[PDB]
Amino acid sequence: MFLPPPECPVFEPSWEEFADPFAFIHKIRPIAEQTGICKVRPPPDWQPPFACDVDKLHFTPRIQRLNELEAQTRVRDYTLRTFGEMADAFKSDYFNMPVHMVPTELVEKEFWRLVSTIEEDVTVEYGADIASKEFGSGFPVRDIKLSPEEEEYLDSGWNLNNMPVMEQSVLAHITADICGMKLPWLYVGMCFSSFCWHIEDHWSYSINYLHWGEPKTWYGVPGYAAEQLENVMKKLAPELFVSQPDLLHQLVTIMNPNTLMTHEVPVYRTNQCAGEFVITFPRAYHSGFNQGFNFAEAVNFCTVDWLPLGRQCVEHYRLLHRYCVFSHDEMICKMASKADVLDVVVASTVQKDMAIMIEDEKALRETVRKLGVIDSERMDFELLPDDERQCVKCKTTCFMSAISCSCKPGLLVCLHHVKELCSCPPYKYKLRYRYTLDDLYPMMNALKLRAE
Numbered sequence: 123m124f125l126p127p128p129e130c131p132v133f134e135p136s137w138e139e140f141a142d143p144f145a146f147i148h149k150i151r152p153i154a155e156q157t158g159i160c161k162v163r164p165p166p167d168w169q170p171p172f173a174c175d176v177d178k179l180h181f182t183p184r185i186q187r188l189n190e191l192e193a194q195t196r197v198r199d200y201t202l203r204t205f206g207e208m209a210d211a212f213k214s215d216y217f218n219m220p221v222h223m224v225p226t227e228l229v230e231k232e233f234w235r236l237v238s239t240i241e242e243d244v245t246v247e248y249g250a251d252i253a254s255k256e257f258g259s260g261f262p263v264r265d266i267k268l269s270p271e272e273e274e275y276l277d278s279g280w281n282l283n284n285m286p287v288m289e290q291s292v293l294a295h296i297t298a299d300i301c302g303m304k305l306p307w308l309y310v311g312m313c314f315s316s317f318c319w320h321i322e323d324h325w326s327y328s329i330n331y332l333h334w335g336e337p338k339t340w341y342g343v344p345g346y347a348a349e350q351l352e353n354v355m356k357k358l359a360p361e362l363f364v365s366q367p368d369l370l371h372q373l374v375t376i377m378n379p380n381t382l383m384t385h386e387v388p389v390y391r392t393n394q395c396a397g398e399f400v401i402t403f404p405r406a407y408h409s410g411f412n413q414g415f416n417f418a419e420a421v422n423f424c425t426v427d428w429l430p431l432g433r434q435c436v437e438h439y440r441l442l443h444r445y446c447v448f449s450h451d452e453m454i455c456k457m458a459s460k461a462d463v464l465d466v467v468v469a470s471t472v473q474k475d476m477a478i479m480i481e482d483e484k485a486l487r488e489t490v491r492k493l494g495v496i497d498s499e500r501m502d503f504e505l506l507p508d509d510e511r512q513c514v515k516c517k518t519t520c521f522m523s524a525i526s527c528s529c530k531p532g533l534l535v536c537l538h539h540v541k542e543l544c545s546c547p548p549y550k551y552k553l554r555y556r557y558t559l560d561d562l563y564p565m566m567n568a569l570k571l572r573a574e
């Protein structure tokens with residue numbers, strides 16, 4: 123027996139409200155961040171054109187078994203037509219019904235039954251990948267000859283290709299290769315194909331658009347309940363919490379929302395239909411499944427609101443020895459170096475994060491100096507491959523500074539883990555720093571000036 127969570131908030135902005143996506147999100151944040159997810163119905167006039175030949179679109183399917191609490195990684199060939207045909211026949215055969223006459227309530231109820239049952243070993247398939255020449259964005263991009271209809275949506279703020287380059291997303295300024303993160307993912311779904319409970323890398327927002335097809339069912343949990351949900355999962359599925367060698371290597375799972383609700387974790391649901399958006403807020407857990415054959419597109423993004431949470435996330439990561447996707451501080455400094463061309467509100471928020479960064483860095487350098495580290499040299503960390511600049515203990519990506527030691531060449535620790543590097547005496551250690559405090563304070567003041 124399954125009891126559907128309460129519905130999450132649904133917004134129907136006017137064209138005036140809908141115009142600027144970042145302003146609209148900021149306005150709904152008070153409501154939506156209490157539920158973790160929300161749904162956005164664009165004005166009826168807003169309808170981006172979906173033109174597509176299902177025979178030339180091809181992708182490699184991924185296979186998925188559907189067992190509650192079973193571990194899954196978060197890491198053959200179909201055309202969109204053959205997949206679609208496979209998907210419809212599956213659902214149609216499973217229920218002995220036309221795919222559209224099966225109620226969403228029923229598919230939901232059936233999903234939670236089959237993932238629970240040991241006897242059932244339903245496997246399904248799906249597509250998940252970054253856009254490519256074999257399978258491109260569902261939104262119009264610049265390239266062949268576009269219709270005027272297509273051209274109209276080229277520059278839309280809700281065209282998800284545009285989010286990795288809007289200034290209001292601080293992830294745009296990142297000049298590092300983080301393709302997995304800042305580029306939109308494309309998802310081809312069939313009935314029961316499922317995304318396990320997770321939050322986004324670095325606690326970022328995400329936004330998801332269902333282009334066409336049968337709906338996508340979501341479950342969302344507000345950011346404030348994140349560790350509570352983690353406690354419940356740690357008690358019921360500990361194998362998901364054994365630490366992992368690489369970032370692609372995260373274990374996740376399917377878990378009945380009722381189980382979370384039973385343990386006082388607030389959960390909300392929704393059915394995302396074609397032409398609707400779902401937005402997930404920072405550190406809001408979500409999961410769900412598809413009702414049938416469909417096509418979605420999704421991307422992460424980071425508003426100014428997020429910057430302090432961004433800093434908190436990386437400290438988390440340090441404590442948990444989890445790898446980082448990028449350096450938060452390296453991003454902060456990149457923005458500071460372009461203060462003159464920053465949006466004024468952005469510059470203000472960045473300045474505030476940078477002040478915390480600098481006083482924290484000050485204290486850490488005083489601490490390592492009292493541990494006997496005397497020698498130092500400037501080091502351009504941004505030039506090192508990421509796997510070449512992780513703290514050997516906590517795996518954090520170094521940028522502001524690190525300690526090295528001649529006794530163990532090429533190894534680094536962050537300044538929280540000076541004691542974890544070599545067993546040589548302190549004078550053989552070196553402080554590697556990107557900037558001096560004297561370098562940093564003017565960078566921060568440029569941001570201050572820019573913000574008046």
Ligand SMILES: CC(C)C1C(=O)n2ncc(C#N)c2N=C1c1cnn(CCN(C)C)c1
Pocket residue numbers: 194195196197248249250309310311315316317318319320330338374412418420
């Ligand atoms: C079933 C699949 C096409 C799919 C999907 O439809 N969605 N829709 C939203 C999300 C998210 N977050 C999302 N994520 C999906 C997805 C990716 N990677 N994986 C593999 C591991 N996953 C179960 C967490 C599933």
Ligand SMILES: [Mn+2]
Pocket residue numbers: 188189190236237238239240241242243244
């Ligand atoms: Mn099962």
Ligand SMILES: [Mn+2]
Pocket residue numbers: 320321322328402408
């Ligand atoms: Mn997600």
Ligand SMILES: [Mn+2]
Pocket residue numbers: 516
């Ligand atoms: Mn530790």
Ligand SMILES: [Zn+2]
Pocket residue numbers: 440513514515516517518535536537538539
């Ligand atoms: Zn460390």
